[PDB]
Design a protein around this nucleic acid. Structure first.
Lengths: 205, 150, 129, 123
RNA sequence: UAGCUAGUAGGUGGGGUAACGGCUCACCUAGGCGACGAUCCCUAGCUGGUCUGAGAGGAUGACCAGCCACACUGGAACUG
RNA sequence: ACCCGCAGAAGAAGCACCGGCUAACUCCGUGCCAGCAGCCGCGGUAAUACGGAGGGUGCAAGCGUUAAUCGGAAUUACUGGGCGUAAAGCGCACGCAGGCGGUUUGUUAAGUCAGAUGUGAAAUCCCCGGGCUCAACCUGGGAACUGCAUCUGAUACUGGC
RNA sequence: GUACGGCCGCAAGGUUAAAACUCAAAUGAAUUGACGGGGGCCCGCACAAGCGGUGGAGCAUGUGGUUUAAUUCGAUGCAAC
RNA sequence: ACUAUGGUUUUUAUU
């Protein structure tokens, strides 16, 4: 599922921008995040003792568009070869084909990037791939199919990608819409909207 | 910097004529530095009163335990007041893990890489003591340098 | 009444060490003086002496160095009614390698080291740290 | 128990709930019904409730509750019977299903519509 | 369920089968089996496998591959 | 199968949950009635517990309810239970058949430990090469299955003599 | 220790000893109230005892019952009238 | 040496 409902009401409830429906009217003010302080008290009357990590667990899911059962499986595979769930977990999410199509700039949102992958428009090493959870490795070449290379939103997404922070671990050419992974993303750069004592005891908590 | 932690705060009311009035019990650890662990109980009216009343007791007692690499040198069992605690070494990065009354003793000793479990009693005032008994059963060296001669 | 000469061997040591005693004494036997010879070689005790014309009694001396007991675990493992037998790679690593075990074997009483070096296994007699 | 005692005979075994296969190890079965009547609740309360008595071809005889916003039942009317004790209505261990047979359905809801059975209007 | 049994337990002589044994008969012998549960009664495809949990352990063996039995209910075996 | 075109947002979203534990909650109506409940317990004039309503929480071609099995369960306890009372130690004496038994020597090899040759069907786990993106599946090569037998050492302990 | 069979006793009895049904319980310890026809030291006018009363008549001023058209609604043992 | 009986449910604070 993709939730398919109104988006900005989620980011406002998390006091954090989730990049949902981002671009154009969503850059430079009028997103209104953390600007409604209420008429009396913090509206935490109450509220739940486990609210952290519980809302942080929805945040880290919703901000990549990743579902519980797959996120729990990421937390299990991330431990292999001494990978550490405090490091490899985030680098696996950033290494997704739907995030790589978003970081190469062909989608303005991770949803828009996913909707290029599933709609049979994306290739990895010349082979067509429709799996948004495909893990891109330090030798993979990612590109678009000829039927989609001239689409309006794809060209508009590249006009936003050049204003976004540069992902130094990859290469891309916009005239062919073809790029290559050169390094795995690293925690010394890869930084997220999550607190440092949270999601390090994920599940059973 | 002196090492400290708050474990838990619980309502421990007073039975009175006509009903009940409300007080709080706090459980803390302090001691006399890292790996020099001291425990504190404190009950008061109000939460912050109980917490400080406990920490001023945790600054009267301490035990200096063998932890010469800041980590579990071997898997160990500890027991006190029906609470039984088992601890084994794990990998450092996300390795903490373990319930708050075991964890609090490990934090004031600088241990961040464990896998540990409670058995028998989960009464928090005693799980802390059983963890401090487990650290009494912890070791250091490499005893082939002391037992054998030379 | 009394079935096993080893069932009152190590209690004396564990309880005497708790009483802060420098020496511990027991009735002597072949296996008691065989265990003591290896515990001296591995440095777990300082010395041992054995004497008696009516009943031979064995006294061993405990290590405390400058005050703190030097043997940090003293266990049996195995008993005649339910014996423990370990094979050449199933030989134990006592206290996760901070301690040692003692085995009887076909070549006579030795350490888990000497047994694994001899590429063999056998029956457990003592566990120490 | 001692090692000798356990080598002679191991400790006795227990079975928590799966000891009596009254409903043939199913959640539900069918019953024709032999009696309709009202049962009175535990503690004095207006919550008096109708029940159907069912007899099974395996030799068991049981009492089922008929909840679902009504009652249309009589003897030999044939209904489905599910496992479900009523903790304030003594001796009633079973519950009626309204998805099938002569036990009528319920009014349409937006909330709690996976309960009993709900048809669509032509609208 | 504490005792059970009469080819049950041992010998002598025939016959039988491709071959064995009480295997099947006829006669001499009284032994044989029991608290490591004999005797009797209820239940029953077995294992590769399956699910569960960190595992131990537990609950269980459709299909699956192999093996043993069955052909409405029952007897005899014959062909090859 | 795969390729090319005609096609237009067009044909495509559920179900459970929101007093305390327990995520999200307020207002209406009912007024111990009706309708609820995993436990504490709900409903008589503010019902966060029923029915609705407006807003939230959860998962999603699924979501939910049950009679039950595994987990939580070390509360069946081997890894790993308990017997003064909370629940179990016989009111007592002797003792056959069972369990258990000091120590010096040799010897037997049932048992242990060590080394081999056979075997432990194929699927299959796990490593790993192909084939469809990942994988279910078809597999190509490995591994394990501590076992069991048959030969042969060690000669220490236990039984035996 | 309720039911069935077996064993043993002249008998009362001695022995083995469930299942269904049903509830969040049974139970050991320590802690603080309160209560007693319980304890010790003791105080209250409370008991006692030296007196005055209200209870009986007629009249007045409030509370129930009775009643009508209203005969108002509460207070109402110590703590009302 | 006056004392047997006594139906139902019952109040404070939590993130």
């Amino acid at each position: 599922a993709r939730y398919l409902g109104p988006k900005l009401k989620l980011s406002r409830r998390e006091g954090t921008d989730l990049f949902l429906k981002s671009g154009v009217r969503a850059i430079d003010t009028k997103c209104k995040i953390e600007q409604a302080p209420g008429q009396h008290g913090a509206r935490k009357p109450r509220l739940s003792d486990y609210g952290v990590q519980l809302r942080e667990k929805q945040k880290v899911r919703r901000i990549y568009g990743v579902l519980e059962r797959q996120f729990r499986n990421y937390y299990k595979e991330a431990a292999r070869l001494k990978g550490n769930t405090g490091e490899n977990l985030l680098a696996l999410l950033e290494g997704r084909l739907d995030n790589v199509v978003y970081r190469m700039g062909f989608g303005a949102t991770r949803a828009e990037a996913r909707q290029l992958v599933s709609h049979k428009a994306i290739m990895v090493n010349g082979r067509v791939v429709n799996i948004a959870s495909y893990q891109v490795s330090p030798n993979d070449v990612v590109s678009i199919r000829e039927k989609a290379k001239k689409q309006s939103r794809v060209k508009a997404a590249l006009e936003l990608a050049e204003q976004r922070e540069k992902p130094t671990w990859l290469e891309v050419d916009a005239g062919k819409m073809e790029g290559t992974f050169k390094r795995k993303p690293e925690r010394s750069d890869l930084s997220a909207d999550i607190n440092e004592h949270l999601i390090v005891e994920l599940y059973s908590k | 910097e002196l090492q400290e932690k708050l474990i838990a705060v619980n309502r421990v009311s007073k039975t009175v004529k006509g009903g009940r009035i409300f007080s709080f019990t706090a459980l803390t650890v302090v001691g006399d530095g890292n790996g020099r662990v001291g425990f504190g109980y404190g009950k008061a009216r109000e939460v912050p009163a109980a917490i400080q009343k406990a920490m001023e007791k945790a600054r009267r007692n301490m035990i200096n335990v063998a932890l010469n690499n800041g980590t579990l040198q071997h898997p160990v069992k500890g027991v006190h007041t029906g609470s039984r605690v088992f601890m084994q070494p794990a990998s450092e990065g996300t390795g903490i893990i373990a319930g708050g009354a075991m964890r609090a003793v490990l934090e004031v000793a600088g241990v961040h890489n464990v896998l540990a479990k409670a058995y028998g009693s989960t009464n928090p005032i005693n799980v802390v003591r059983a963890t401090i008994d487990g650290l009494e059963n912890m070791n250091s060296p490499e005893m082939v340098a002391a037992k054998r001669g030379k | 009444s009394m079935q096993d000469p080893i069932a009152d061997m190590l209690t004396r040591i564990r309880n005497g060490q708790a009483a802060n005693k420098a020496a511990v004494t027991m009735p002597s036997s072949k296996l008691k003086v065989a265990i003591a010879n290896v515990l001296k070689e591995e440095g777990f005790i300082e010395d041992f002496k054995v004497e008696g014309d009516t009943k031979p009694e064995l006294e061993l001396t405990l290590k405390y160095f400058q005050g703190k007991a030097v043997v940090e675990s003293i266990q049996r493992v195995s008993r005649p009614g339910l014996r423990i037998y370990k094979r050449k790679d199933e030989l134990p690593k006592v206290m996760a390698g901070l301690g040692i075990a003692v085995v009887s074997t076909s070549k006579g009483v030795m350490t888990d080291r000497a047994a694994r070096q001899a590429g063999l296994g056998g029956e457990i007699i003592c566990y120490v740290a | 128990a001692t090692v000798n005692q356990l080598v002679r005979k191991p400790r006795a075994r227990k079975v928590a709930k799966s000891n009596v296969p009254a409903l043939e190890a199913c959640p539900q079965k069918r019953g024709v019904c032999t009696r309709v009547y009202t049962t009175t609740p535990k503690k004095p309360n207006s919550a008096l409730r109708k029940v159907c008595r069912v007899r099974l071809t395996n030799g068991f005889e049981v009492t089922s509750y008929i909840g679902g916003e009504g009652h249309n039942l009589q003897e030999h009317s044939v209904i489905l019977i599910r496992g479900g004790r009523v903790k304030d209505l003594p001796g009633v261990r079973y519950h009626t299903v309204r998805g099938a047979l002569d036990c009528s359905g319920v009014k349409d809801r937006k909330q709690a519509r996976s309960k009993y059975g709900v048809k669509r209007p032509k609208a």
